[PDB]
Amino acid sequence: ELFRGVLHISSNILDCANDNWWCSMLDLDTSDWEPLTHSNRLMAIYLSNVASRLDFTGGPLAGCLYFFQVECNKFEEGYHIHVVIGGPGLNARNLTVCVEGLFNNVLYHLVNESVKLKFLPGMTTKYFRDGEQFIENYLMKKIPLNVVWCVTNIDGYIDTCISASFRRGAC
Ligand SMILES: [Mg+2]
Numbered sequence: 001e002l003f004r005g006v007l008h009i010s011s012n013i014l015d016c017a018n019d020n021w022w023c024s025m026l027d028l029d030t031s032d033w034e035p036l037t038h039s040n041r042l043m044a045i046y047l048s049n050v051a052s053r054l055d056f057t058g059g060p061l062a063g064c065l066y067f068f069q070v071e072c073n074k075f076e077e078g079y080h081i082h083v084v085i086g087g088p089g090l091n092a093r094n095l096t097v098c099v100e101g102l103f104n105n106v107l108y109h110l111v112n113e114s115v116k117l118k119f120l121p122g123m124t125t126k127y128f129r130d131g132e133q134f135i136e137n138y139l140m141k142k143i144p145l146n147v148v149w150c151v152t153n154i155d156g157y158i159d160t161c162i163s164a165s166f167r168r169g170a171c
Contacts, residue, residue: 002065002086002131003095004122007103009070011077013115014039021045021110032163034144043070043079044149049106051151060089060098067131067152067161069139079148082139083119084131092127095119141170 024045030036036044047070054066064087070079083099090098096119103117122128135157139147143164150161160166 001129002067002084002135003090003092004128004131004134005083005095005099006120006122007081007083007099007117008073008120009043009079009081009117011079013107013111014042016111016113016115017042018110018112024049029162032165034164036145036149040145040148046070046106046110047081047149047151049110050103051153053106054102055153057102060094061087061102063088064090065154067135067139067150067154067157069142069150070148071142071146072148084135084139086131095121095127140167143167143171 021042026045026048028036028041028044028048047068050068051066054061054064064085066083066085068084069082071082072079081103085095085099099119100117103119104115107115107117122134128134135154139150140157140161144167147167152158152161
């Protein structure tokens with residue numbers, strides 16, 4: 001059972017990038033993707049950093065399954081990361097605080113200014129618990145560069161997630 005939520009990243013945050021963010025030496029398997037523009041790569045770096053820090057985290061985030069997808073905002077500048085996550089120790093009472101701590105320690109290493117991300121959970125007018133079906137019915141049916149990047153540790157999606165052709169098949 002996997003939770004669902006969104007974090008918005010305004011374009012002003014990209015302006016504050018320091019040398020640890022820009023000079024990342026990551027390889028990024030784009031064998032089945034579109035050429036990722038510089039800022040697209042900055043967001044791919046950020047997403048890989050957050051997944052990396054999450055894979056060996058402790059506390060409530062240890063042993064959790066995650067699926068993060070960063071996309072460009074449809075009508076404005078900026079990006080938004082669709083966050084689907086669930087794991088032992090993870091409940092509705094700590095989801096927001098855990099996600100904000102995780103994402104901000106990574107962002108802090110890569111920025112010159114004091115920034116904070118606000119997590120917005122899927123909820124009716126009760127936290128949503130359809131994350132696996134949210135991944136299947138919506139997040140995975142986007143084709144780049146509508147979706148900019150994606151990271152996951154869920155068996156099955158570990159590779160079928162950064163493959164443009166597989167995303168193009170559901171279309
Ligand atoms: Mg979206």
